[PDB]
Design a protein around this ligand. Structure first.
Ligand code: JEG
Lengths: 39, 41, 359, 368, 107, 71
């Protein structure tokens, strides 16, 4: 699904505040409180 | 030589009894002062 | 405890440290030794066996005991079927009619209590994290050092200066130097000797301050500060915490969305049995292992290299599994109540929980 | 409802009060899950109640009289009650426990007995080297031990320096270990017999509990003489017992484990503490009194286990239960200057002297 | 805190030691044990100093916002705040701190 | 400078005031304290941690001269 339909939000990784992880190959998607983001 | 004996007892190395009490008091004072100095430091 | 019987079939005679012979019962179940997994007779003995025996003493019913096939307590799942899910484990053995009762440390929870009834808890326990403990033997030769040896040599130089000042003051040789070195370990002669004595006492007091300062170590705030800890909350690649998969702990962590991160951290490092995880924690393969405090505290008592984390979480209990449709659970719960009342559980806990002095 | 005070109806008028707390919030959460409206009332007869001359009293009596379907409170669970009425899954662990206050071998502990043997062997080798350099050897050992307590020439000097360093290190480590000591208590396994036999300790130990309570019934059940001795030692209330503990009118108090523990945590200054570091006897739980087997039952049990499942019990324990004395970070206190442990080590010190006297007598025997 | 009973037991021990010395007049081993006991006594004298130095038991009735005394208000400890302030709005907002606000309302 | 982290947006953004109200909702409810407790928490709150003699020696030499004067 494409996100285009909003208020697009851009961010930057700074710990602890911003933590970026690799998407789970076994799950196929994000889990728990993690949210999908694109770069 | 008396003051030398007194100061000798003060620091870690009727007359005899007094010297004994002075030596005990000096040991207590020295141990307390050293331990308290270590603790305070 | 489960142990294989001798070729004669007779159970080996053992006794507690108190000088009391340990009762044993026959249980047929899977052996981890054999390549295959056929159920074989083995002697099982312990707190639960003694409890079952005492129950059989109070209530006229006899008992046939056997070990569970899967080797797990109980779980609800379906491998090949999305439509319907079935129980597996001792719980499944209870619902399948394979066993009329389950005597074991089975944790009481809402999920299991639906299908099966639980007797009043014989043991109150909760979950605590177990991590490796190490005796900080160090500084022996290195706390001989921390004076940096510059100050001690400077003490020797001060002794030399005191001897020179002693010579100069006495003028206003070898025996005096030896007397000075001995003191280390005219008006100004006595002044030099007094200052040397005071400086020596001050040096000893400084060595004691350094020793006392050096003894305090590793700081407060250990690896596990409670159920909630930054090391526990944020699963760093360095610190690995885990638990036994397909168990009550697994269901508890998988139940809450808050603990879902902890479930993600444990899922990869999880083990089938608690023994392998404990051996891993002892060998520092696994950083921390969450489990029952009943087993964990006992392991911490048994081996002094293992310590359990404070702030016990998930207060719960262990009870005998029973079907709701079976009339024995009433008198069983009553008997467990009387068992706690008389103080038999006190003697049983003093028995199986050793609390060694770690000599 | 109260009989003597009556505005109208002569006992018909009842006074309204506001009840709240841990058990109250638990009852509300449970009633929230079970979804039934209810009417709360207070028991006028006794606090908890027990059976005298064949008759039940209190909440259980109100349940037997059908005046109450389900009883919620600080009531404990025992063998006798559970037969006639049903009890819900235990909310918290509580039972017969003792609260006490402590007023007050570390010397040998710091050496671990290894330092003594090592120093003895090294002093034996040094005394052998000094002897190479009958009573003279005894004077050599006398010199070594003389250096050990800090009251050929080079070896003795270095040995004296090492002995001085060892002495200072031993002093600092002994002071540090004496400061770091904790967990000190009495009757670790309750089998100490202090409370058991009053005449074994002079003066006799004073201990009691609140009468007509569950702890009292269990106390009379397990120990007869303990019940007979604590009969005159019975306290009116837990507050009166705490006052009796503080003012010195009672040595130890026997009460509910959870109540005693909260009283410990909420204690101002944390003066009084539980025995056995939270050790409890009979290990009972807090349930909910109910009717005959037909009823809600398993639904209520599932609701309590659900309450445990969500984890709200931990937060409830944090608000209503947990104290500021948990923040102690392991070791509770210093015990300060008063020790009496040195008096304990005095016996061990005296024993080697007695053995040396035995060796002196044995040497005298060989002479004769 | 030695109660003067321990000091008197020490003096009595001195008299007993003097009596044993007179009676004796292998004693070197006993004297050695006496020396070790003396070192232990001095180290204990340092231990008393360390003990007066410690002062390791603060009560800390009020720790933080989630402290037991604040979360569960007692009639002994009276906590309050400035009326018609940010504190009032903060406490009245949460139902958990609403009880503490009820406790403050009188005080 | 006692700076803080806000949320960057375009000028005259209408979503400003709403975001401000929610952020202040986190402090008003006290949920900001709990969230900060969760993510910003850490393990260690606290951790780690001759001239006079020579002066006395010089004073001792001056004491030698002064004793020589006193003798
Ligand atoms: N909970 C108690 C009971 O009777 O249920 C009151 C308490 C006591 O007096 O120790 C036990």
């Amino acid at each position: 699904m494409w996100p285009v339909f909003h208020l697009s939000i851009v961010t930057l990784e700074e710990a602890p505040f911003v933590i970026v992880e690799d998407v789970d190959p076994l799950s196929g998607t994000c889990m728990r409180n993690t949210v999908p983001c694109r770069k | 030589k008396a003051i030398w004996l007194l100061w000798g007892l003060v620091f870690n190395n009727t007359s005899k009894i007094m010297v004994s009490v002075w030596a005990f008091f000096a040991v207590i004072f020295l141990a307390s002062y050293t331990a308290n100095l270590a603790a305070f430091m | 405890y489960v142990r294989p019987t001798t070729s004669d079939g007779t159970c080996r005679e053992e006794y507690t440290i108190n000088g009391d012979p340990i009762k044993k019962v026959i249980c047929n179940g899977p052996d981890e030794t054999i390549p295959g997994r056929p159920t074989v007779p083995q002697c099982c003995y312990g707190f639960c066996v003694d409890l079952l025996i005492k129950l059989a003493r109070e209530m006229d019913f006899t008992y046939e005991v056997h070990l569970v096939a899967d080797g797990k307590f109980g779980t609800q799942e379906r491998v090949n079927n999305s439509n319907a899910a079935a129980w597996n484990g001792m719980m499944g053995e209870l619902l399948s009619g394979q066993a009329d009762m389950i005597v074991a440390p089975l944790t009481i929870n809402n999920e299991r209590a639906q299908y099966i009834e639980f007797s009043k808890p014989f043991k109150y326990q909760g979950l605590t994290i177990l991590v490796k403990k190490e005796i900080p033997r160090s500084t022996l030769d290195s706390f001989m050092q921390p004076f940096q040896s510059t100050l001690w040599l400077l003490v020797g130089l001060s002794v030399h200066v005191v001897a020179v000042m002693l010579y100069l003051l006495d003028r206003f040789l070898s025996s005096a130097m030896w007397f000075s070195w001995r003191v280390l370990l005219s008006f100004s002669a006595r002044i030099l000797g007094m200052v040397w004595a005071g400086f020596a006492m001050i040096i000893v007091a400084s060595y004691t301050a350094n020793l006392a300062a050096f003894l305090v170590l590793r700081r407060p705030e250990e690896r596990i500060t409670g159920i909630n800890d930054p090391r526990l909350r944020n699963p760093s690649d360095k610190f690995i915490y885990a638990t036994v998969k397909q168990s009550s702990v697994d269901i508890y962590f998988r139940r809450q969305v808050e603990l879902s991160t902890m479930y993600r951290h444990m899922e990869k490092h999880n083990y089938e049995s608690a023994a392998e995880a404990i051996q891993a924690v002892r060998d520092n393969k696994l950083h921390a292992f969450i489990w029952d405090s009943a087993v964990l505290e006992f392991e911490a008592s048994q081996k002094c290299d293992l310590v359990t984390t404070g702030e016990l979480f998930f207060r719960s209990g262990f009870g005998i599994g029973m079907r709701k449709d079976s009339p024995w659970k009433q008198e069983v719960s009553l008997n467990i109540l009387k068992s706690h009342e008389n103080g038999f559980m006190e003697e049983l806990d003093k028995t199986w929980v050793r609390y060694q002095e770690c000599d | 409802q109260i009989r003597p005070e009556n505005r109208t109806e002569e006992g018909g008028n009842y006074i309204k009060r506001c009840c709240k707390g841990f058990c109250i919030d638990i009852l509300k959460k449970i009633a929230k899950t079970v979804k039934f409206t209810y009417d709360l009332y207070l028991v006028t007869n006794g606090k908890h109640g027990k059976k005298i001359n064949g008759v039940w009293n209190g909440m259980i009596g109100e349940v037997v009289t059908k005046r109450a379907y389900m009883a919620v409170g600080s009531l404990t669970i025992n063998e006798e009650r559970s037969e006639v009425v049903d009890f819900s899954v235990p909310f918290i662990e509580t039972g017969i426990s003792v609260m006490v206050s402590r007023s007050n071998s570390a010397f040998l502990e710091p050496f671990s007995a290894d330092v003594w043997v090592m120093m003895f062997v090294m002093l034996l080798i040094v005394s052998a080297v000094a002897v190479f350099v009958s009573f003279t050897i005894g004077k050599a050992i006398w010199l070594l031990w003389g250096l050990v307590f800090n009251n050929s020439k080079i070896m003795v000097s270095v040995w004296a320096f090492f002995a001085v360093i060892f002495l200072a290190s031993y002093t600092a480590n002994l002071a540090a270990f004496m400061i770091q000591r904790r967990y000190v208590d009495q009757v670790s396994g309750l089998s100490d017999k202090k409370f058991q036999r009053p005449n074994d300790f002079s003066p006799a130990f004073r201990f009691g509990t609140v009468p007509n309570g569950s702890t009292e019934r269990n106390i009379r059940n397990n120990y007869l003489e303990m019940h007979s001795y604590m009969v005159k030692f019975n306290q009116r209330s837990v507050q009166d017992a705490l006052l009796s503990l503080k003012s010195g009118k009672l040595d130890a108090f026997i009460y509910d484990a959870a109540v005693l523990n909260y009283m410990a945590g909420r204690d101002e200054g944390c003066k009084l503490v539980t025995i056995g570091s939270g050790k409890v006897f009979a290990t009972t739980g807090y349930g909910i009194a109910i009717q005959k087997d037909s009823g809600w039952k398993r639904q209520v049990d599932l609701a309590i286990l659900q309450l445990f499942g969500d984890g709200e019990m931990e937060e409830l324990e944090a608000l209503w239960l947990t104290g500021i004395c948990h923040n102690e970070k392991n070791e509770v206190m210093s015990s300060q200057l008063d020790i009496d442990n040195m008096a304990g080590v005095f016996y061990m010190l005296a024993a080697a002297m007695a053995l040396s006297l035995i060796t002196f007598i044995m040497e005298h025997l060989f002479y004769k």
